User: Fold this.
Amino acid sequence: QSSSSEPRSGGIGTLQFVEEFVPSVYFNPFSGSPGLYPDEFIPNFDAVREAVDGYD
Amino acid sequence: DINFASLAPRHGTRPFMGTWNE
Amino acid sequence: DGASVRFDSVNLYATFFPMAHNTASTLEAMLRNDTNDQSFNDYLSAANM
Assistant:
């Protein structure tokens, strides 16, 4: 069979990552309600649960 | 001769303070 | 007339509002954006000659 016995899923490699994730142009930035801001720009936001990853 | 600052006031809501969309 | 000083130490103190960690992160994200720069005059501004 040569190929791995179940298709991989997870994160992504650098070649896919650069074809995804093109720079985001945010017009009228921070205009809406909180809870609809682009929160996953924030480098320590735990996007699974709308909370920010502390040290504790 | 030149003091200034952001101001378009509101008090505490029926919630009073801190939760900040109406 | 003989006055003198010595400095034994300098320390920097700083104090933080203990703001809720996702709220402060929501404020931070708003203030890191080029539409929202902080700005200030010299509070009684001139060129002094």
DSSP finds one helix and no strands in chain C. The two ends of chain C are 32 Å apart (CA to CA). Chain C touches chain B through five residues (CB under 8 Å). The longest helix of chain C spans residues 21-31.
